[PDB]
């Protein structure tokens, strides 16, 4: 600590006085995260063996909630033509918990691959299906040109190119009839500078990549302030209070000492906040408990030493904290 002041003052002679050098902080010893039991596992690999998928606006959904999803059967490694992923890989979803999961399957074009993205616009994004901002998964795609493609175009599948307005996330339109396309309603039957909203795939196996079918499977993810029902492959790492730990509670990740308080919360209020809009007190999603968030102790380091020509004795001072280690 005598040399800590030498590098702070950038000199080999330390004059008498008090000088600040570093900042001490208590690191978390363990990780306390608590969520209840797992319900079921999502069909990540069961939708890859389907014979034919739905269209862009027709996407079929199988509802299996409570991530962790199925990590066992994974076809996503080097088995397909193109891999475009966002967020984290599905192998890493075992460390995260999501509320609801909707497995969707649809076929798009070459120029429509770049339009796939959470919270982004596009022809199929706004007018057909939009990815929510809560989706951390990978977008799986493969080239179906050897199957779904037909001579002169395949009109079996359909898609909607135009709509009177953009669709919000998690919204569907199954209507195949003639409705308003642009901003000026033409009152039913096509004409008056409007366009027929429904469209058909023109897939020709002999043209470029933009005109060829690509089977895309996306599992819709949802993340809210609702309490999570699952934690990891392992759950509790049983709580021991009055210690510095790293906690994730109801989706709020932080580091601090967990203590019990007298705070009275409403049954439907999951967690509160302080005047700083930061985590203050939270409730146990698994069982009935009330925990208060106390961040771990930290402060500045003060060095009290006499002159270099006087003595080498050094007194270390911690500001506004109690030392339990020493």
């Amino acid at each position: 600590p005598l040399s800590e002041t030498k590098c702070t003052l950038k000199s080999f002679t330390v004059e008498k006085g008090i000088y600040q050098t570093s900042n001490f902080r208590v690191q978390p010893t363990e990780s306390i995260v608590r969520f209840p039991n797992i319900t079921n596992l999502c069909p990540f690999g069961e939708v890859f063996n389907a014979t034919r998928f739905a269209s862009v606006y027709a996407w079929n959904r199988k509802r299996i909630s409570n991530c962790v999803a199925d990590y066992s059967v994974l076809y996503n490694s080097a088995s397909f033509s193109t891999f475009k992923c966002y967020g984290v890989s599905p192998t890493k979803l075992n460390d995260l918990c999501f509320t609801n999961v909707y497995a969707d399957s649809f076929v798009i074009r070459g120029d429509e691959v770049r339009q796939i993205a959470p919270g982004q616009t596009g022809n199929i994004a706004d007018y057909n299906y939009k990815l929510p901002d809560d989706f951390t998964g990978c977008v799986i795609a493969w080239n179906s040109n050897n199957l779904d493609s037909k001579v002169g175009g395949n009109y079996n599948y359909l898609y909607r190119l135009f709509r009177k307005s953009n669709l919000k996330p998690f919204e569907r339109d199954i209507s195949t009839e003639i409705y308003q396309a642009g901003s000026t309603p033409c009152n039913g039957v096509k004409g008056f500078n409007c366009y027929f909203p429904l469209q058909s795939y023109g897939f020709q196996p002999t043209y470029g990549v933009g005109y060829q079918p690509y089977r895309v499977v996306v599992l819709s993810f949802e993340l809210l302030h609702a309490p999570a029902t699952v934690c990891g492959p392992k759950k509790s790492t049983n709580l021991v209070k009055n210690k510095c730990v790293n906690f994730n509670f109801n989706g709020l990740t932080g580091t601090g000492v967990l203590t019990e308080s007298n705070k009275k919360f409403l049954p439907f209020q999951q967690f509160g906040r302080d005047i700083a809009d930061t985590t203050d007190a939270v409730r146990d999603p698994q069982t009935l408990e009330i925990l208060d968030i106390t961040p771990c102790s930290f402060g500045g380091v003060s060095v009290i030493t006499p002159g270099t020509n006087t003595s080498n004795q050094v007194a270390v001072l911690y500001q506004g904290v109690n030392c339990t280690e020493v």
């Binding site: 302080d274 700083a276 930061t278 961040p295 402060g299 500045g300 500001q319 506004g320």
Partner: peptide
């Protein structure tokens, strides 16, 4: 004229004064 401890959690450190309140009235 707690607000002090609430602000100390985000990295705002209020240093105690060298001259306390008891010694001020003793100088006066």
């Amino acid at each position: 004229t707690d607000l002090i401890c609430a602000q100390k959690f985000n990295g705002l450190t209020v240093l105690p004064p060298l001259l306390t309140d008891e010694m001020i009235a003793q100088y006066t």
